[PDB]
């Protein structure tokens, strides 16, 4: 299990990642933390 990574307690609404023009939806605000693509 993880242990204090590089989270930031949610992003803002739907832009957790740091970029105003990404390539694909990955980082999202979930569980009050930054989560990647999950199927």
């Amino acid at each position: 299990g993880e242990d204090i990574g590089h989270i930031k307690y949610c992003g803002i609404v739907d832009d957790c990642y740091k970029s105003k023009k990404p390539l694909f939806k990955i980082w999202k605000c979930v569980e009050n933390v930054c989560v990647l693509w999950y199927k």
Side-chain angles (χ1 to χ4, degrees), residues 7-33:
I7 64 95
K8 63 268 232 82
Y9 285 125
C10 197
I12 182 63
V13 59
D14 226 296
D15 207 297
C16 201
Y17 45 63
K18 268 90 75 106
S19 173
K20 306 282 135 164
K21 54 269 232 201
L23 176 80
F24 248 102
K25 262 134 258 178
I26 305 120
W27 294 106
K28 313 293 240 59
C29 173
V30 187
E31 314 211 37
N32 313 301
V33 295

